[PDB]
Amino acid sequence: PLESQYQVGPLLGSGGFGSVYSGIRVSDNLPVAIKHVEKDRISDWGELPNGTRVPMEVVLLKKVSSGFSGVIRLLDWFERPDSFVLILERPEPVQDLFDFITERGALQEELARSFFWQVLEAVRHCHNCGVLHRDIKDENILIDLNRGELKLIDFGSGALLKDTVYTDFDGTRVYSPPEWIRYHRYHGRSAAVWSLGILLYDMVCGDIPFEHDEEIIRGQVFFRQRVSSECQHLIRWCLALRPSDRPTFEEIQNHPWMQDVLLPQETAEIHLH
Numbered sequence: 001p002l003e004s005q006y007q008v009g010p011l012l013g014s015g016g017f018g019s020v021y022s023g024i025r026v027s028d029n030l031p032v033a034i035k036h037v038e039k040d041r042i043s044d045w046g047e048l049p050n051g052t053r054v055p056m057e058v059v060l061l062k063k064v065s066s067g068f069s070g071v072i073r074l075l076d077w078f079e080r081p082d083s084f085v086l087i088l089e090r091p092e093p094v095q096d097l098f099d100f101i102t103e104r105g106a107l108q109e110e111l112a113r114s115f116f117w118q119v120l121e122a123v124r125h126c127h128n129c130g131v132l133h134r135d136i137k138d139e140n141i142l143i144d145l146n147r148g149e150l151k152l153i154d155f156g157s158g159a160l161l162k163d164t165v166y167t168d169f170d171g172t173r174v175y176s177p178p179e180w181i182r183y184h185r186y187h188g189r190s191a192a193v194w195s196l197g198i199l200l201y202d203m204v205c206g207d208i209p210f211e212h213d214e215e216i217i218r219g220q221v222f223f224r225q226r227v228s229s230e231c232q233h234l235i236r237w238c239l240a241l242r243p244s245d246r247p248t249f250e251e252i253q254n255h256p257w258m259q260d261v262l263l264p265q266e267t268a269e270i271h272l273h
């Protein structure tokens with residue numbers, strides 16, 4: 001019944017994640033995103049609790065989509081003969097963090113603090129649910145412009161969280177940690193923290209800190225914008241070369257730069273209205 005339940009609108013984007021369209025749920029006019037993925041291009045499968053063969057992406061989304069959170073929720077899904085179709089929440093109006101930064105340049109620290117805090121809360125939620133995102137970056141973060149609320153997208157490179165080593169990685173290279181570059185090995189949480197350091201730098205500097213493998217491995221951070229000593233410190237800690245020298249999520253959120261975070265609505269009033 002997919003074609004009757006949803007009115008399809010314009011294409012929003014396409015890439016390694018498939019093709020995503022704007023949509024409306026006909027039942028109640030709820031704005032949705034409709035994501036199509038060809039079966040040929042799915043290397044990663046799992047099974048539901050009740051147990052049919054689905055993309056791992058659906059497993060992971062189902063695990064994180066219970067209750068409210070800073071993740072774009074899976075509302076429904078459908079199987080077609082050559083594709084899967086996912087129905088996702090769609091905030092309106094919305095802009096991804098990559099475009100937002102591209103247009104406004106480097107973010108004021110107050111705005112970066114609010115945004116970074118919300119990303120931490122969302123990643124914590126994922127980890128709590130037993131999901132590792134593995135591609136945390138500006139283009140996988142949506143901003144609900146009216147509410148000042150950030151939402152994580154794209155679990156297509158994600159995995160079940162585990163305490164043992166990962167030796168596969170399909171995320172974005174320039175957000176990938178030095179242990180991946182050097183050894184093709186990482187642990188979930190510490191690699192996530194590295195990607196968070198890259199993200200935070202991107203927010204306050206308006207560009208990523210490392211372009212080449214050699215710079216990632218060297219791990220020396222140069223600031224191109226005026227950034228507070230406390231923010232520089234947090235970034236440098238997240239980007240520690242040794243995984244065990246990086247902060248835990250608790251330590252990031254208890255860091256002095258992260259004090260007195262604005263609520264999402266206040267952030268929208270001050271910075272987005």
Ligand SMILES: N[C@H]1CC[C@H](CN2c3ccccc3Oc3ccc(Cl)cc32)CC1
Binds near residue numbers: 020153
């Ligand atoms: N850098 C990208 C360019 C394409 C869109 C695609 N998109 C999406 C892509 C992949 C997985 C889930 C997605 O979930 C969405 C939910 C809601 C909207 Cl409005 C959009 C998506 C977002 C920004």
